[PDB]
Amino acid sequence: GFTGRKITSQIFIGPTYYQRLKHMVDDKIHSRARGPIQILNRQPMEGR
Amino acid sequence: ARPEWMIVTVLPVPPLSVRPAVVMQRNQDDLTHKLADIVKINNQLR
RNA sequence: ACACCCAGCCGCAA
Secondary structure, three states, rough: OOOOOOOOOOOOOOOOOOOOOOOOOHHHHHOOOOOOOOOOOOOOOOOO | OOOHHHHOOOOOOOOOOOOOOOOOOOOOHHHHHHHHHHHHHHHHHH
C-alpha cells in the first residue's frame, strides 16, 4: 500500500465470517487519581 | 499477659470506625447488632 | 463546592 511495489510473497485472500464481541475498550478503560474513598477501609473503592 | 487476664471479664466495645453505621441514602453493621444483643443479655442477667 | 450503604448470588474476560 505504501510503496506500491509488489509484495514478494503472495497473500492468502478471501471472505470469511467475523463477529464483533461484547468486549469494548471504551468500557474496559479506567483510571484513578485520589477519587472516592471506601467508608470502612478508608481505601480506594471497587469497580470502574 | 496474666492467667487471670486469660478470661475475658470486661468485653471491649470497638469504636464506630470499626463498625461504621451507614444510612440508606441508619443501617447497623452485623457486629453492632451482635454487641446490642450481648449488652441486652448482660442487662437481662443483671 | 460533588453523590451513590452493605452483604449475598451469578455470568464473563486474561
